[PDB]
Each structure stands twice: as structure tokens, then as C-alpha cells.
């Protein structure tokens, strides 16, 4: 009945270590609209995170883009942490630069 | 420009 969010974590441009970029977490296909999204750098919450205005698809499910400027490196780990009514605990999706 | 009826339709 309620719909759980789909989650993609990715960059605006192909990642180059040491080059400034944007980290995106795109949440979609969810209903109802209340949703908690954090972007994480090495497990810790990034403060300066912006998001798009609430919109929805033809099937009425909602979508939002959360984003922050970042400069990727070899060892730094990035993730998106998402909570929604349909989830028993927050879901954490790691950024893979090849997806 | 958004739809702006004189009376906005009620359910």
C-alpha cells in the first residue's frame, strides 16, 4: 500500500580524485512524502545539504534530489542514509563511482 | 500560469 524509496547515489560529473564535484542522492518511487535523507562522509553527517522541491511521477510516487558539493578522493567514503515509514531502520547506500 | 477558476472545485 505504502511505497518504499528507491535510492541512487552518484556524482554530477564523472569522479576525478581531487576535483570538485556534486554528490547526489536521488530518492524516488516512495509514498507517503515524508522522508529523512542524510549524506555521510566517512560515516558522519554532511551539514550543507540541499534538496529539490517535492514533485511526483505519473504513478503518484514522490521524488527528491539531495545534493552537496564534494571533492572525491581515493579513501574517503560517501553514503546516503534514508528513513521512511516503510523502513524498520534507516537504509544506507554507499556511493560507488561506477554506478 | 496556474489554473485560476472563480470557484475552485471542491470534492
Amino acid at each position: 500500500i505504502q511505497r518504499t524509496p528507491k535510492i541512487q547515489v552518484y556524482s554530477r560529473h564523472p569522479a576525478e580524485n581531487g576535483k570538485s564535484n556534486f554528490l547526489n542522492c536521488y530518492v524516488s518511487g516512495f509514498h507517503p512524502s515524508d522522508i529523512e535523507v542524510d549524506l555521510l562522509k566517512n560515516g558522519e553527517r554532511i551539514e550543507k545539504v540541499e534538496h529539490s522541491d517535492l514533485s511526483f511521477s505519473k504513478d503518484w510516487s514522490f521524488y527528491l534530489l539531495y545534493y552537496t558539493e564534494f571533492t572525491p578522493t581515493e579513501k574517503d567514503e560517501y553514503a546516503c542514509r534514508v528513513n521512511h515509514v516503510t523502513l524498520s531502520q534507516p537504509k544506507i547506500v554507499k556511493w560507488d563511482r561506477d554506478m | 500560469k496556474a489554473f485560476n477558476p472563480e470557484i475552485i472545485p471542491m470534492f
Binding site: 511505497r3 528507491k6 541512487q8 552518484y10 554530477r12 560529473h13 564523472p14 556534486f22 547526489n24 536521488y26 524516488s28 518511487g29 509514498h31 507517503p32 512524502s33 515524508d34 529539490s52 522541491d53 517535492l54 514533485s55 511526483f56 503518484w60 510516487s61 514522490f62 534530489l65 545534493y67 561506477d98 554506478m99 | 500560469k1 496556474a2 489554473f3 485560476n4 477558476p5 470557484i7 475552485i8 472545485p9 471542491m10 470534492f11
Partner: protein, 274 residues
Amino acid sequence: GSHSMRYFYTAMSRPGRGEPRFIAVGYVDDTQFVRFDSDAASPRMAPRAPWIEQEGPEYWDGETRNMKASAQTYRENLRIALRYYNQSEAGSHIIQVMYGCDVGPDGRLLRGHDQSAYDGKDYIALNEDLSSWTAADTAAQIIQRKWEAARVAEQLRAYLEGLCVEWLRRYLENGKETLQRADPPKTHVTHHPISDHEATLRCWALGFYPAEITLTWQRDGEDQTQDTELVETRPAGDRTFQKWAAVVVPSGEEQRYTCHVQHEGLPKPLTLRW
């Protein structure tokens, strides 16, 4: 049909946490250009694309007035929906609406839209005739009777055939540099071994606008529909979109696979191999 304008409203009740929130967004094609949020410090219809900024105070004040009136009407519709579904005042519910117009290359109306949902399920829709309604259930049939009695469809029709198309045409002219520009996808294929026996081929499309795109993998010239992993088309944040399609292939058979890309910004479809 070459362009669309759409408004999307979401009205969300939250008993115990104030009055229902009302959010509206407007789009031309895949470009957002306005928003309104009843929770904002100072709610107004606000620009989200540069080409709308030139509209004068009369425009912005009128749009703001409309959104505020709309928020009030949708708060009442949320209360009515409770009565129509025998639901209590304790629960949280959502009404969504989408409406607008599609125009062809010559700017004439191709078709109009006005559809409502309650709790994420179809409620009532204006039919393509812009004259009759399709109700999803017996609750929506009550609304249908009211709207038939009050000739609501005629009002929507007048807007959709008139102001909707006229204002869409205006925006398309004011935003001609972006709204009337297709950016073709930058494409490539990447290869990711998963074992000695199999590898993933991933066909990428990046930096494209509008969002509509077709990515398909063929093996020996046959579409691999059932065997292709396709991600949802996703925004890059710079107006453009990204998508990929992946297949798992036997190692040594990579050259039997071809990725095919169709997009409005391409003169002809592309064929890629690894």
C-alpha cells in the same frame, strides 16, 4: 507533440502538527520553473528558472494569491475525503493533483490533463475529451456528480485550450535558449569483470535533456529486454539527466553485444560496443 506545461500540487494532512502542508511546482517539459510551499517562512510563488524572473509584480502576486486560495481549498478537500472514506481525523492523508497542456510544433493544443489522487491512488480524472470524468471508486463518483452539476469540466477546458497554451507558448519563447534546446547524451560503454566467466557491460548516457531516452542492449542483434538492468533516469542537478543499462555477458562474448541509444537530440540512433 513537442512541449508540455504541468502543475503538480501536493496537500498533506498531519493531525497534531498544524494545518495540512500544500506544495506546488510548475514545469515546462523537464524544467521546473516555479514553486510554492505553505510552510516557507513567507509563502509566495517563487521562480526556479531564469526565464520566468522577468515576469512582473502582477504575475507573482496573482500566482501567490492563487496558491494561497488553492491551499485553503485542498485543506477542505482533505476534510471532505475523510467523510467520503469513513476515515478519522487522527490519520495523515495526501491529495495530489496534476494538470496542464501539451502542444505540438505549431503551438496548438495536442491534449489536456487534469488528474487527482488520494493517498497515492487514482481518484478522479478529466477525460481526453475535456468534457467528462472518470471516477476510480464510489467516493470519486460523488465528486463526479458535483462537478457534472457545476459544469467544472467546461472551466478546465477553457483554461487548457486558452490560457494554458498561450502561457506555455510565451514561456517557450522567453526560455528559447534552453527549453527549445535538446542536449544529446554523451555515451560510452564500460566493462566490469565479475568473475573469470562473466563481465558486466554498462552503457552510459550522460548530460542529456530532455529526460526521455531509450537505452537497449542487443545480443547478436536481438533485444535483451528481459536480461537488461535499467536504472531509473536520474537528474544530474545541472538540468540534465543520466541513465545506464547493464547486461551480464559471458567472458569472450563482449563483441556480440551492442548498446543502442535513441534521444531527441541525436540526428540518428547510436550504436555502441565495448
